[PDB]
Amino acid sequence: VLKRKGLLIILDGLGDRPIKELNGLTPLEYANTPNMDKLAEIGILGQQDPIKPGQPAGSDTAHLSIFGYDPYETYRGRGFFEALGVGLDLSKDDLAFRVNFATLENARAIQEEVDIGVDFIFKTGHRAVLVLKGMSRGYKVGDNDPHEAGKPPSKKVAEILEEFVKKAQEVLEKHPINERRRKEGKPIANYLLIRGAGTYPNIPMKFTEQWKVKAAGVIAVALVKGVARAVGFDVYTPEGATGEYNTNEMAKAKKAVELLKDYDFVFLHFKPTDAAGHDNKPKLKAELIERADRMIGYILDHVDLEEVVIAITGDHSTPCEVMNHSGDPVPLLIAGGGVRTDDTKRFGEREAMKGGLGRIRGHDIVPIMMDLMNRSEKFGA
Amino acid sequence: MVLKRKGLLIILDGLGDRPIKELNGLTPLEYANTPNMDKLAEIGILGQQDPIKPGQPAGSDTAHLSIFGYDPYETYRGRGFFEALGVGLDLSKDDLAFRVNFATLEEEAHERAIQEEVDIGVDFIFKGLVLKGMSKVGDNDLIRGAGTYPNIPMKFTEQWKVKAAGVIAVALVKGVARAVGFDVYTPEGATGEYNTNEMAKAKKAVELLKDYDFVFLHFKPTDAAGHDNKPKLKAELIERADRMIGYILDHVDLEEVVIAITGDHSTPCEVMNHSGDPVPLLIAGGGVRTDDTKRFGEREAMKGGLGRIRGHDIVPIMMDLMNRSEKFGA
Ligand SMILES: [Ca+2]
Ligand SMILES: [Ca+2]
Ligand SMILES: [Zn+2]
Ligand SMILES: [Zn+2]
Ligand SMILES: [Zn+2]
Ligand SMILES: [Zn+2]
């Protein structure tokens, strides 16, 4: 018997709620998406709860779920994923944090200003060794060495962190950029807001070994590249992919198709749809879902569905009326060899409510894909 | 007493089609992004209509005689007359009108000259009958369609005791409409070609509803794309119609205006000509018993609450929704 490849596509924050300006439709329904409708037509639809009914999931916990893990048991914080995201190589005993440059006195800093402000801090010195690297805008990443055990900020690390903020401030309050900054009347980046303490996730085994496959992912956003790396994926970020409105989606598709030739399972992430939701811009979000449809249309023109099982959904809902992640289930579609196609015709939340897959959990998606790919092993007998 | 309403009938020439492979098995209308018509389908009611009868292809003129509530076979007396009426001429019972085409002879090698060049050529032909440049026509007291005075019972306006106006560009449809009692207009930009100005048609249409009780709006281009077998283009044209229709919805109160949308016949790309396939029809507004359809398309029309009707049942249904129908008996 022949096994098949897998293609899991995530349209970040896809799910939404009825929008009045869209005649009561959601951005996904309103948006012209002939390719996803074609796939929903020959495929099967369903609704998935990343975590559980009515429970909003952060981007990191939602993706652990999408990759096939139980977020409530594997999740050990965000920091570590962010650190792996910026390309660092950490040990399972390290503790990482997401850092925001702030202003303390008794700024929307530039991406290059944080890289410099970060450099000087690396070159700050306390009891334990640490890595401090900037990521994007006023953000940054802090890594405390073999301190995973104190991941719930414990007493020891908060004193280190507290010495680190005091010490960091000294370094910070002195950089020329800040120096130019107070002169230019701009709020200085002299304080450090540290949060999202995280260690390596408590997962039994990696994705690759669990399912015995080679797995690659086309991803731009740091946090998602981190989760993917933590579970064992070979992450790629093609030229042009920024995870923002100006991203090259056709470049992501081009790469996804390439990777299918050397990997068994490929994961593709598209982030911009989620930003439009956070900013309450229904039309824009719908416009972005349309760019994704064309991206998908490209992939479909270069792959055989009898050889590739395709799944498309969102890691979670991000309603424009909520301007943040919601607990609303997310539309899901699966098409390809092995699928028992239901009678749904288009891809949308109301249609998914009638799909043959029913209402499942986000961590059900990979197992069902793996089974359609004939890569599942029985339990018992 | 009881409030009467106005009616607005929109005809997208050749709207109907057949499933197209490159369009994933969908028709151009189903494939096209039409939020405004889908919205109207959702709040309205759908059905399919046979211009003349099941499996019977109808020309643009006979189909419109049907759509205006008449009987094709009893009223139709040739294409020429309507063509002549569409150019502003005033013909008499004993005249014989014709459709003329400026073509190249060498054997007829080519049957695209500029409008101004045709009138200039029309002027000199007439200088040394009535030959007139349209976008030509020959009236006798690449020519064809010998038509004579049309035999219609009575005018649309008298029949329904209403003031009717139409926003048309194509000569042929302007003729049929004038012939039935319509005050026909044609704003600047409206050309009946792919380059026409759908917005001018919609703008004029809204304005016309202020002084008229029934307004008819015709859109030609969709049909042209069907003839040349251009699926993607037909869809784009249909999308332009949806925008046009959107403007109108942003300026009229559906509770006072009964709106109907359909084609006068099917012009399937794979046929490059008129077919006898029933055309999708939608009706929305005051008095309508909304069914459970959610989009405007041939397949959804198959599930509409109006069922499969004739082209000549449309006006009667609109008029009854406008409370302008009259009981027979009692
Ligand atoms: Ca199906
Ligand atoms: Ca309805
Ligand atoms: Zn997300
Ligand atoms: Zn988000
Ligand atoms: Zn026609
Ligand atoms: Zn035609």
Side-chain angles (χ1 to χ4, degrees):
Chain A
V1 179
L2 185 64
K3 297 177 177 183
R4 290 178 271 241
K5 287 175 185 295
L7 180 48
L8 176 52
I9 298 181
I10 294 300
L11 307 190
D12 213 284
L14 186 56
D16 215 296
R17 295 174 179 176
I19 306 287
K20 189 171 179 290
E21 70 188 67
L22 304 182
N23 313 304
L25 307 186
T26 61
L28 169 53
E29 294 165 330
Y30 180 80
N32 179 47
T33 62
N35 287 293
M36 288 184 267
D37 293 1
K38 176 226 295 235
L39 287 177
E41 195 283 304
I42 44 79
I44 190 174
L45 261 50
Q47 309 185 81
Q48 65 93 351
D49 289 304
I51 299 178
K52 57 177 180 173
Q55 175 59 68
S59 211
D60 51 354
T61 59
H63 273 99
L64 277 168
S65 182
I66 295 297
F67 290 129
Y69 300 98
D70 177 288
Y72 280 137
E73 306 194 72
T74 56
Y75 193 60
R76 288 290 186 287
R78 173 174 183 174
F80 200 98
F81 298 123
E82 211 77 53
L84 293 188
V86 297
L88 306 177
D89 297 305
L90 288 58
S91 304
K92 291 184 177 57
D93 62 336
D94 294 314
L95 185 58
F97 308 80
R98 57 195 295 287
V99 188
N100 296 74
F101 286 113
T103 304
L104 174 73
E105 62 178 61
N106 301 119
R108 278 294 189 147
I110 300 296
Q111 216 172 149
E112 191 172 359
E113 259 137 29
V114 154
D115 177 271
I116 194 21
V118 161
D119 175 80
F120 254 90
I121 278 169
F122 228 152
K123 264 142 169 245
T124 293
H126 47 357
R127 307 314 306 174
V129 175
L130 72 306
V131 181
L132 195 98
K133 192 172 171 297
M135 51 183 272
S136 288
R137 289 200 279 193
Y139 306 114
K140 180 183 68 176
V141 180
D143 182 64
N144 283 352
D145 278 88
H147 269 84
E148 61 84 46
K151 76 181 157 61
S154 228
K155 193 208 241 145
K156 194 174 169 237
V157 173
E159 303 184 343
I160 300 181
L161 290 173
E162 283 257 334
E163 169 169 338
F164 187 82
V165 174
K166 284 178 174 182
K167 260 176 214 216
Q169 196 178 245
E170 290 184 22
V171 187
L172 278 179
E173 261 175 339
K174 230 185 299 172
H175 210 250
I177 295 175
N178 283 324
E179 278 311 321
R180 184 194 91 171
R181 260 175 98 74
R182 186 139 210 219
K183 180 186 54 186
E184 287 184 294
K186 304 186 108 182
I188 61 177
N190 73 316
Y191 205 61
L192 278 200
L193 290 189
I194 308 174
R195 53 198 319 188
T199 73
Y200 182 79
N202 180 199
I203 61 163
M205 56 186 88
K206 323 208 78 179
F207 194 88
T208 47
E209 60 179 303
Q210 182 179 173
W211 304 101
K212 307 175 182 178
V213 299
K214 291 176 181 179
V218 175
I219 315 171
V221 193
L223 185 53
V224 176
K225 298 172 57 186
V227 175
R229 270 167 181 160
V231 302
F233 282 75
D234 287 335
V235 178
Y236 294 86
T237 311
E239 297 292 303
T242 62
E244 298 189 300
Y245 302 132
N246 62 274
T247 296
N248 200 308
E249 64 264 14
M250 297 308 259
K252 282 176 177 170
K254 192 279 188 297
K255 186 58 188 175
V257 183
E258 283 184 61
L259 297 169
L260 274 170
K261 291 174 184 174
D262 296 302
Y263 286 93
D264 310 297
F265 196 84
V266 170
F267 170 67
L268 172 55
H269 191 277
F270 183 69
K271 185 63 161 51
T273 40
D274 183 60
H278 271 291
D279 295 308
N280 195 147
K281 300 176 292 190
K283 301 264 193 176
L284 175 55
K285 181 172 177 174
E287 198 288 300
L288 289 168
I289 292 174
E290 276 182 39
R291 286 173 52 189
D293 199 61
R294 303 188 197 100
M295 170 184 78
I296 292 147
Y298 174 81
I299 297 170
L300 295 185
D301 289 321
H302 298 107
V303 307
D304 176 35
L305 287 180
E306 173 50 54
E307 300 179 298
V308 185
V309 177
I310 185 173
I312 300 173
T313 190
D315 55 322
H316 64 71
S317 284
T318 300
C320 289
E321 76 163 57
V322 183
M323 292 180 81
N324 212 310
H325 302 189
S326 72
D328 301 291
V330 186
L332 164 60
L333 84 66
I334 303 175
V339 172
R340 316 201 274 211
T341 179
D342 59 22
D343 57 39
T344 53
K345 298 299 182 180
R346 286 180 307 295
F347 188 48
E349 291 93 324
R350 261 59 74 82
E351 201 74 23
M353 275 175 232
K354 302 183 303 184
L357 287 173
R359 180 165 191 168
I360 66 188
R361 289 297 161 84
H363 52 68
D364 288 314
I365 293 180
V366 167
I368 287 171
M369 280 178 88
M370 285 295 162
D371 186 56
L372 286 162
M373 285 154 77
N374 294 320
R375 292 176 186 281
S376 58
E377 291 178 293
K378 80 192 70 174
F379 169 75
Chain B
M1 306 182 99
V2 172
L3 276 175
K4 281 174 155 56
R5 304 187 245 254
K6 301 173 177 303
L8 169 58
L9 170 55
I10 301 169
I11 291 298
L12 279 42
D13 215 286
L15 188 55
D17 211 303
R18 296 177 178 179
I20 294 180
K21 312 177 188 303
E22 50 181 296
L23 296 194
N24 303 332
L26 304 173
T27 68
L29 169 61
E30 303 167 318
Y31 179 90
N33 182 41
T34 61
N36 299 297
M37 289 189 268
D38 293 352
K39 176 196 171 189
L40 289 169
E42 205 282 324
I43 48 182
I45 187 171
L46 267 52
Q48 325 177 70
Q49 60 100 334
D50 289 291
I52 301 182
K53 66 169 183 179
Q56 184 49 55
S60 211
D61 52 0
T62 46
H64 276 87
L65 284 169
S66 290
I67 304 299
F68 285 122
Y70 297 103
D71 169 53
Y73 302 117
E74 180 204 305
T75 57
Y76 195 56
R77 291 290 181 286
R79 178 190 186 170
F81 208 87
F82 298 119
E83 212 71 63
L85 279 173
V87 292
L89 301 186
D90 305 295
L91 287 56
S92 58
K93 303 175 299 182
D94 66 316
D95 301 327
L96 190 68
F98 295 99
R99 194 294 192 300
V100 185
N101 246 39
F102 270 120
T104 313
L105 188 70
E106 188 171 356
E107 180 183 1
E108 205 270 56
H110 186 329
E111 48 182 48
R112 242 72 175 200
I114 314 176
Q115 219 178 344
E116 304 69 55
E117 283 188 335
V118 173
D119 168 283
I120 293 296
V122 167
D123 185 34
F124 181 79
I125 269 194
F126 206 167
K127 196 167 172 162
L129 67 88
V130 184
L131 179 70
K132 175 77 173 304
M134 217 304 122
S135 253
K136 57 200 229 179
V137 179
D139 185 19
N140 288 311
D141 303 298
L142 308 126
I143 185 171
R144 53 149 186 175
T148 63
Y149 207 64
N151 165 52
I152 83 163
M154 62 174 104
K155 303 301 185 61
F156 191 93
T157 44
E158 179 191 5
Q159 188 174 178
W160 305 104
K161 295 182 178 63
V162 304
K163 275 234 314 162
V167 178
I168 319 164
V170 187
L172 185 42
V173 176
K174 283 184 63 175
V176 184
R178 273 167 175 154
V180 296
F182 274 80
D183 267 338
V184 169
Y185 300 89
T186 309
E188 275 294 299
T191 58
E193 301 287 302
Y194 300 138
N195 46 276
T196 192
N197 199 295
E198 51 266 42
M199 294 304 105
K201 288 176 177 172
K203 289 176 180 297
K204 185 55 186 173
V206 174
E207 283 183 349
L208 289 183
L209 281 173
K210 297 181 182 180
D211 307 309
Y212 289 99
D213 305 301
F214 189 90
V215 174
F216 165 73
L217 178 58
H218 179 273
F219 186 72
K220 191 60 183 50
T222 43
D223 179 55
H227 281 288
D228 295 306
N229 183 200
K230 293 292 181 180
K232 296 276 189 170
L233 178 65
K234 191 163 179 180
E236 187 176 63
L237 291 167
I238 286 157
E239 303 187 309
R240 284 168 57 182
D242 194 65
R243 277 190 268 291
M244 166 177 87
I245 294 177
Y247 180 67
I248 303 179
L249 294 188
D250 298 308
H251 287 105
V252 312
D253 193 314
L254 288 183
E255 183 50 47
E256 309 176 313
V257 175
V258 168
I259 181 177
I261 301 172
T262 185
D264 55 325
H265 55 72
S266 288
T267 300
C269 291
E270 69 161 63
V271 177
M272 305 179 87
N273 219 314
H274 303 184
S275 65
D277 294 298
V279 186
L281 161 57
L282 87 66
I283 300 184
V288 170
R289 307 197 290 210
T290 185
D291 52 19
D292 51 313
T293 47
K294 301 293 184 179
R295 282 191 157 195
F296 189 33
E298 282 85 332
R299 274 60 170 256
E300 207 87 313
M302 284 174 176
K303 306 189 302 180
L306 283 173
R308 182 171 187 156
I309 64 179
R310 289 292 161 86
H312 61 68
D313 295 313
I314 300 174
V315 159
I317 289 171
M318 292 186 72
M319 288 293 163
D320 182 56
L321 288 171
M322 298 168 217
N323 302 314
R324 286 183 194 275
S325 61
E326 297 201 59
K327 59 155 55 182
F328 162 56

Short mmCIF file of all heavy atoms in Angstrom, two decimals, chain A residues 10-14 57-60 62-63 223-224 269-271 274 278 314-318 325, ligand 3:
data_model
loop_
_atom_site.label_atom_id
_atom_site.label_comp_id
_atom_site.label_asym_id
_atom_site.label_seq_id
_atom_site.Cartn_x
_atom_site.Cartn_y
_atom_site.Cartn_z
N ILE A 10 -2.03 26.94 7.41
CA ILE A 10 -2.64 27.74 8.46
C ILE A 10 -2.76 29.23 8.09
O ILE A 10 -1.76 29.91 7.79
CB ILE A 10 -1.86 27.65 9.79
CG1 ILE A 10 -1.94 26.22 10.35
CG2 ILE A 10 -2.41 28.66 10.80
CD1 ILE A 10 -3.36 25.74 10.63
N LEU A 11 -4.00 29.72 8.10
CA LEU A 11 -4.28 31.11 7.82
C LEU A 11 -4.58 31.73 9.19
O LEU A 11 -5.71 31.71 9.65
CB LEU A 11 -5.49 31.23 6.88
CG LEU A 11 -5.36 30.40 5.60
CD1 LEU A 11 -6.48 30.80 4.66
CD2 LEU A 11 -4.01 30.62 4.94
N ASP A 12 -3.52 32.22 9.83
CA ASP A 12 -3.57 32.82 11.16
C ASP A 12 -4.81 33.70 11.42
O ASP A 12 -5.12 34.60 10.63
CB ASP A 12 -2.28 33.62 11.40
CG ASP A 12 -1.83 33.60 12.85
OD1 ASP A 12 -2.44 34.32 13.67
OD2 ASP A 12 -0.87 32.84 13.17
N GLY A 13 -5.50 33.41 12.52
CA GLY A 13 -6.69 34.17 12.89
C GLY A 13 -7.84 34.13 11.88
O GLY A 13 -8.69 35.01 11.86
N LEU A 14 -7.87 33.08 11.05
CA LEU A 14 -8.90 32.92 10.03
C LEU A 14 -10.34 33.13 10.51
O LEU A 14 -11.09 33.94 9.96
CB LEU A 14 -8.79 31.54 9.39
CG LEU A 14 -9.70 31.27 8.20
CD1 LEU A 14 -9.49 32.33 7.11
CD2 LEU A 14 -9.40 29.87 7.66
N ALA A 57 -7.02 30.74 22.44
CA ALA A 57 -5.67 30.21 22.50
C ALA A 57 -4.66 31.24 22.01
O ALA A 57 -4.91 31.93 21.01
CB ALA A 57 -5.56 28.96 21.64
N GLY A 58 -3.53 31.35 22.72
CA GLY A 58 -2.48 32.25 22.28
C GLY A 58 -1.91 31.58 21.03
O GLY A 58 -2.15 30.39 20.80
N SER A 59 -1.15 32.32 20.22
CA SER A 59 -0.60 31.74 18.99
C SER A 59 0.29 30.51 19.23
O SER A 59 0.27 29.57 18.44
CB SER A 59 0.20 32.81 18.23
OG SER A 59 0.14 32.58 16.83
N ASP A 60 1.08 30.52 20.30
CA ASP A 60 1.99 29.40 20.60
C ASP A 60 1.25 28.12 21.01
O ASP A 60 1.52 27.04 20.46
CB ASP A 60 3.01 29.82 21.68
CG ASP A 60 2.35 30.45 22.91
OD1 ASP A 60 1.12 30.67 22.89
OD2 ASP A 60 3.08 30.73 23.89
N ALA A 62 -1.85 27.39 20.43
CA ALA A 62 -2.72 26.97 19.33
C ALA A 62 -1.94 26.11 18.35
O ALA A 62 -2.49 25.14 17.78
CB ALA A 62 -3.31 28.20 18.60
N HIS A 63 -0.67 26.45 18.14
CA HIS A 63 0.15 25.70 17.18
C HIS A 63 0.66 24.37 17.76
O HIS A 63 0.89 23.40 17.05
CB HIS A 63 1.33 26.58 16.73
CG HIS A 63 0.92 27.44 15.55
ND1 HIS A 63 0.55 28.74 15.66
CD2 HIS A 63 0.85 27.07 14.20
CE1 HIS A 63 0.28 29.16 14.40
NE2 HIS A 63 0.45 28.17 13.50
N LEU A 223 7.60 33.55 16.58
CA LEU A 223 6.95 32.65 17.53
C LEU A 223 6.51 31.31 16.93
O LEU A 223 6.62 30.27 17.59
CB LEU A 223 5.75 33.36 18.18
CG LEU A 223 5.05 32.57 19.29
CD1 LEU A 223 6.05 32.12 20.34
CD2 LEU A 223 3.96 33.44 19.91
N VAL A 224 6.00 31.32 15.70
CA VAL A 224 5.55 30.08 15.09
C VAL A 224 6.73 29.25 14.58
O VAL A 224 6.68 28.01 14.60
CB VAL A 224 4.54 30.36 13.94
CG1 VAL A 224 4.14 29.05 13.25
CG2 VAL A 224 3.30 31.05 14.51
N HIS A 269 2.60 28.60 6.84
CA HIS A 269 1.94 29.59 7.68
C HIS A 269 1.82 30.95 6.98
O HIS A 269 2.74 31.40 6.30
CB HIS A 269 2.73 29.71 9.00
CG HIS A 269 2.04 30.50 10.06
ND1 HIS A 269 2.08 31.88 10.12
CD2 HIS A 269 1.29 30.10 11.12
CE1 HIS A 269 1.39 32.30 11.17
NE2 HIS A 269 0.90 31.24 11.79
N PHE A 270 0.66 31.60 7.15
CA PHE A 270 0.38 32.92 6.56
C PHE A 270 -0.17 33.77 7.71
O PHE A 270 -1.29 33.54 8.16
CB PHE A 270 -0.68 32.79 5.45
CG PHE A 270 -0.98 34.08 4.73
CD1 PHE A 270 -0.03 34.67 3.90
CD2 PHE A 270 -2.23 34.70 4.88
CE1 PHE A 270 -0.31 35.86 3.22
CE2 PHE A 270 -2.52 35.89 4.21
CZ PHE A 270 -1.56 36.48 3.37
N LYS A 271 0.60 34.75 8.16
CA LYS A 271 0.21 35.58 9.32
C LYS A 271 -0.69 36.83 9.16
O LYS A 271 -1.60 37.05 9.97
CB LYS A 271 1.49 36.01 10.06
CG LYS A 271 1.26 36.78 11.36
CD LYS A 271 0.53 35.93 12.40
CE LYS A 271 0.71 36.49 13.81
NZ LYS A 271 0.39 37.95 13.88
N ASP A 274 -4.24 37.58 10.46
CA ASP A 274 -4.43 37.82 11.89
C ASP A 274 -4.30 39.29 12.30
O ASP A 274 -4.96 39.72 13.26
CB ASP A 274 -3.45 36.97 12.70
CG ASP A 274 -3.65 37.13 14.20
OD1 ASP A 274 -4.77 36.83 14.70
OD2 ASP A 274 -2.68 37.57 14.87
N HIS A 278 -6.92 41.86 14.38
CA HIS A 278 -6.55 42.62 15.57
C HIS A 278 -6.89 44.10 15.40
O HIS A 278 -7.24 44.78 16.37
CB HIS A 278 -5.05 42.46 15.86
CG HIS A 278 -4.71 41.28 16.73
ND1 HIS A 278 -5.06 41.22 18.07
CD2 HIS A 278 -4.07 40.12 16.45
CE1 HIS A 278 -4.64 40.06 18.57
NE2 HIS A 278 -4.04 39.38 17.61
N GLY A 314 -7.33 27.68 10.47
CA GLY A 314 -6.60 28.68 11.23
C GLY A 314 -6.22 28.11 12.60
O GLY A 314 -6.87 27.22 13.13
N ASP A 315 -5.10 28.62 13.15
CA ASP A 315 -4.72 28.20 14.49
C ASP A 315 -5.71 28.70 15.55
O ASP A 315 -5.73 28.25 16.69
CB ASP A 315 -3.30 28.72 14.79
CG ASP A 315 -3.27 30.23 14.60
OD1 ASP A 315 -3.92 30.71 13.66
OD2 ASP A 315 -2.58 30.91 15.37
N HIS A 316 -6.53 29.69 15.13
CA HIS A 316 -7.56 30.21 16.03
C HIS A 316 -8.41 31.30 15.36
O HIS A 316 -8.16 31.73 14.24
CB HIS A 316 -6.87 30.77 17.29
CG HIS A 316 -5.99 31.94 16.91
ND1 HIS A 316 -6.49 33.14 16.53
CD2 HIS A 316 -4.60 32.01 16.92
CE1 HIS A 316 -5.41 33.93 16.32
NE2 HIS A 316 -4.26 33.27 16.54
N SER A 317 -9.49 31.71 16.07
CA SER A 317 -10.32 32.81 15.57
C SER A 317 -9.84 34.17 16.09
O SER A 317 -9.39 34.30 17.23
CB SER A 317 -11.76 32.57 16.04
OG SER A 317 -12.34 31.54 15.23
N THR A 318 -9.93 35.19 15.25
CA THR A 318 -9.58 36.55 15.65
C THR A 318 -10.61 37.46 15.02
O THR A 318 -10.36 38.10 14.00
CB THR A 318 -8.18 36.97 15.16
OG1 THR A 318 -7.20 36.08 15.71
CG2 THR A 318 -7.87 38.41 15.62
N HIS A 325 -7.78 37.39 19.84
CA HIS A 325 -8.17 35.99 19.70
C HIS A 325 -9.46 35.69 20.46
O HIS A 325 -9.65 36.15 21.59
CB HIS A 325 -7.07 35.07 20.24
CG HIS A 325 -5.74 35.25 19.57
ND1 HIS A 325 -4.67 34.40 19.80
CD2 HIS A 325 -5.30 36.19 18.69
CE1 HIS A 325 -3.63 34.80 19.08
NE2 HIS A 325 -3.99 35.88 18.40
ZN ZN C 3 -2.05 33.10 15.54
#
